[model samples]
Target: QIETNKKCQGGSCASVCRKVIGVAAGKCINGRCVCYP
Candidate 1:
């Protein structure tokens, strides 16, 4: 789940919403960036 939880939509205006340009992950879950041992 590549979440669009406010942050993805808000750019850099909201206090609780900051843009995530990208993420580095060892693995992913359902297309969501994730890491696990």
Candidate 2:
């Protein structure tokens, strides 16, 4: 689910996003990463 939210903690998911620099990585939702629109 590339365009779907994924479970994350302490910016873990966002970290991955920041690495590639493609995903939205906008923010976290509850305990997940909003990697998509």
Candidate 3:
């Protein structure tokens, strides 16, 4: 997981992302994003 110096910004990242994203076929969520592998 992406370790932030502080805890999640009250879910700010996930919240904004969920609203602005669409699921992809090959994207792996290995604790986060796995596109590189």
Give the candidate number with the greatest TM-score.
2
Worst 10 residues of 2 by lDDT: 1-10
User: How do these models rank on TM-score, best leading?
Assistant: 2, 3, 1
Q: Which residue runs of candidate 1 sit more than 4 Å off their true CA positions? A: 1-25
TM-score, candidate number 3: 0.26
lDDT of 1 by residue, 1-37 (tens): 2333332212332222222443332233343332221
How many residue pairs clash in all the candidates, one count each?
0, 0, 0
Could you tell me the lDDT of residue 16 within candidate 1? 23
In candidate 3, which residue ranges exceed 4 Å CA deviation?
1-11, 22-37
Question: How many angstroms is residue 29 displaced in model 2 relative to the true structure, after the best TM-score fit?
Answer: 0.7
List the global CA lDDT of all models: 0.29, 0.55, 0.31
Query: What pairs collide in candidate 2?
Result: none
User: Model 2: per-residue lDDT, tens digit, 1-37?
Assistant: 3433556756556665655457646456676665542
Listed in order, each prediction's TM-score against the native is 0.21, 0.34, 0.26
Candidate 2: lDDT over CA atoms? 0.55
Q: Lowest-lDDT window of 10 residues in candidate 1?
A: 9-18
**Residue 31 lDDT, candidate 3, scale 0-100:** 35
